[PDB]
Design a binder for this molecule. Structure first.
Ligand SMILES: Cc1cc(Br)c2c(CP(=O)(O)O)cc(=O)oc2c1
Ligand SMILES: Cc1cc(Br)c2c(CP(=O)(O)O)cc(=O)oc2c1
Ligand SMILES: Cc1cc(Br)c2c(CP(=O)(O)O)cc(=O)oc2c1
Length: 269
C-alpha cells in the first residue's frame, strides 16, 4: 500500500540518476513501511563503520575498559581519508575515539584498526548474525571493499536488512541502554551526511546517520534514524549503484529518495 504510493516517483528518480536506487523506510510507530528495491544487494562502502562502532559498543558491555584502551599505530595504518587518526599518529587514540572518528568522520584508518580488534570482516559479520541479520556481509578492509563490482556480493547488504539492523541497535534491545544512547549520539554527531538524508529532514527533527561512498559505479548510500517531533521515529536506508565504473554517485539523488520515502510514510516535512 505505501510501497505503491511512491513506486512511480522512485522509478523516475532512478531513471534520471542512471542507475539503481534501493530504499527501505520504517515508521516505528505504526510499523508501516516503504520499499523500493529493498531486497537487492548494494555495496556497503563506509556505511559498515556504523555497525562496526555498534559491535565495539556491544563488546564493551562485557569487557569494561575496552572503550578506554589506547591504540598506537604506524604511518602504514594511514590509508586515504583518515582525517582524525592522522592528527594523533604520534600519540595514539582510544578505542572510543577511533569509533567516533569512524562514525562521525568516516575515518578509514580508524575503521581498519577497529576491524583488527574485532577479528576482521568475519568478526563484524558474526556480530551482525548475532543480532539476527542474515544478509549483511563484510569481506574486505578499507579501501579494497570499495570496488563495488556489479553482481559481487562481497561487502554488501540490502536496504531492508540495514534498516532492520539499525532499528535493533538504536531503538530495540540489541544494545544495553547506555551503549544504545552512545551509538545514537555518535550517529547524531556525524559530519559527513549534510547533503544526504539530513538534507530531507526539517531542522527541528533529530537525526543520526552514517554515509558510504565507494567512488565508482555510482555507488553511495546513507542510513539514518529520524526523530520527528510528535510521532515515533523513522528508520531508513538509501543505497545507490550504477552499471558503469565511471558513473558518478549523486548526493542529491540520495536526498531526493529520502524525501520520497518520508512522503510515502506520510511524514510531513
Ligand atoms: C590495521 C590493519 C590490519 C589489517 Br589485517 C589490514 C588488512 C588486511 P591486509 O590486506 O593488509 O593483510 C588490510 C588493510 O588495508 O588494512 C589492514 C589494516
Ligand atoms: C565483533 C563481535 C562482537 C560480538 Br558482541 C559478537 C557476538 C555476541 P557473543 O555471544 O559472542 O558475546 C557474537 C558473535 O558470534 O560475534 C560477535 C562478534
Ligand atoms: C577516498 C574517500 C573516502 C571516503 Br571515507 C569518502 C567519503 C566519506 P563516506 O561517504 O564514505 O562516508 C565521501 C566521499 O565523497 O568521498 C570519500 C572518498
Amino acid at each position: 500500500m505505501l510501497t505503491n504510493l511512491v513506486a512511480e516517483p522512485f522509478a523516475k528518480l532512478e531513471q534520471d540518476f542512471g542507475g539503481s536506487i534501493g530504499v527501505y523506510a520504517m515508521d516505528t510507530g505504526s510499523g508501516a513501511t516503504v520499499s523500493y528495491r529493498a531486497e537487492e544487494r548494494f555495496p556497503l562502502c563506509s556505511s559498515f563503520k556504523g555497525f562496526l562502532a555498534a559491535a565495539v559498543l556491544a563488546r564493551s558491555q562485557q569487557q569494561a575498559g575496552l572503550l578506554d584502551t589506547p591504540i598506537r599505530y604506524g604511518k602504514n595504518a594511514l590509508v586515504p581519508w583518515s582525517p582524525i587518526s592522522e592528527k594523533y599518529l604520534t600519540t595514539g587514540m582510544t578505542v572510543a575515539e577511533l569509533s567516533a572518528a569512524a562514525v562521525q568522520y568516516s575515518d578509514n584508518a580508524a575503521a581498519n584498526l577497529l576491524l583488527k580488534e574485532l577479528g576482521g570482516p568475519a568478526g563484524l559479520t558474526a556480530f551482525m548474525r548475532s543480532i539476527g541479520d542474515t544478509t549483511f556481509r563484510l569481506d574486505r578492509w578499507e579501501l579494497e571493499l570499495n570496488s563495488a563490482i556489479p553482481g559481487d556480493a562481497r561487502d554488501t547488504s540490502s536496504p531492508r536488512a540495514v534498516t532492520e539492523s539499525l532499528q535493533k541497535l538504536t531503538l530495540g534491545s540489541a544494545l544495553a541502554a547506555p551503549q544504545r544512547q552512545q551509538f545514537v549520539d555518535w550517529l547524531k554527531g556525524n559530519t559527513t551526511g549534510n547533503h544526504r538524508i539530513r538534507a530531507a529532514v526539517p531542522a527541528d527533527w533529530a537525526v543520526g546517520d552514517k554515509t558510504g561512498t565507494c567512488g565508482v559505479y555510482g555507488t553511495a548510500n546513507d542510513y539514518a534514524v529520524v526523530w520527528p517531533t510528535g510521532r515515533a521515529p523513522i528508520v531508513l536506508a538509501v543505497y545507490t549503484r550504477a552499471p558503469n565504473k565511471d558513473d558518478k554517485h549523486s548526493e542529491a539523488v540520495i536526498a531526493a529518495a529520502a524525501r520520497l520515502a518520508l512522503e510515502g510514510l506520510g511524514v510531513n516535512g
